[PDB]
């Protein structure tokens, strides 16, 4: 088993004695003071915790899925000077269809890691859609410069 | 050693154990009578042969 031991080497370098350090409170005391003999007294050795005994998951009453397909696979996209805002709310979102495909050239998330997006929940999501030049996609980032 | 220093080694040709010790180091102290008195000084090399 994975345990901690304390070994006692002799002046000639062989192990002559040891203590198993999780057998007793006295053994943990001997580990803490690093000695085989203890004087009388009271000694602080460690800290105790109580292990959790259950699991509570609590999420709202949401049943509908929400239109990622009707945002991405859309026929008409507007200009970059006149972009459009769409609100996604009251849905169960998957997010695996975004990072499970090689369809996107640029996929960069600010503030979050991608695979963590499936466990945590939001209030509502806002989507902005436009068509931009080839070399201007690096200007769509916080703290950038350019005409866009 | 207790501070993860190697203090002995085994020779990879003759299989002989050799102890390693640091080269001698320490502090240097200067003893002066004062500048207005003289310009001679004495030097103490601390804890050395």
């Amino acid at each position: 088993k994975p345990t901690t031991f304390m070994l006692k080497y002799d002046e000639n370098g062989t192990i002559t004695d040891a203590v198993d350090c999780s057998q007793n409170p006295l053994a943990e005391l001997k580990c803490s003071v690093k000695s085989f003999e203890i004087d009388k007294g009271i000694y602080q050795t460690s800290n105790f915790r109580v292990v959790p005994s259950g699991d509570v998951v609590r999420f709202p009453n949401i049943t509908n899925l929400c239109p990622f397909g009707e945002v991405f696979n859309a026929t008409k996209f507007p200009s970059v000077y006149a972009w459009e805002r769409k609100k996604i709310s009251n849905c169960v979102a998957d997010y695996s269809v975004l990072y499970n495909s090689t369809f996107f050239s640029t996929f960069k998330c600010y503030g979050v890691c991608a695979t963590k997006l499936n466990d945590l929940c939001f209030s509502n999501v806002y989507a902005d859609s436009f068509v931009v030049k080839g070399d201007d996609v690096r200007q769509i980032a916080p703290g950038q410069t350019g005409v866009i | 050693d207790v501070s993860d220093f190697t203090d002995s080694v085994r020779d990879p040709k003759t299989s002989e154990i050799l102890d390693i010790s640091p080269c001698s180091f320490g502090g240097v102290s200067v003893i002066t009578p004062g500048t207005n008195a003289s310009s001679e000084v004495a030097v103490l090399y601390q804890d050395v042969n």
């Binding site: 088993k1 994975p2 345990t3 901690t4 031991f5 304390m6 070994l7 006692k8 080497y9 002799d10 002046e11 000639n12 370098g13 192990i15 040891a18 198993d20 350090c21 580990c31 690093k34 000695s35 | 207790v2 002995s8």
Partner: peptide, 30 residues
């Protein structure tokens, strides 16, 4: 039947000489 392992199954943890100390180690022990 079942017996008890009274202070048995201690091995040298690594290939390092040590002398006249007490050494704490954490590994897979009996």
């Amino acid at each position: 039947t079942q017996h008890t392992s009274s202070m048995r199954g201690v091995y040298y943890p690594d290939e390092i000489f040590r002398s006249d100390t007490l050494y704490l180690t954490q590994d897979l022990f009996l």
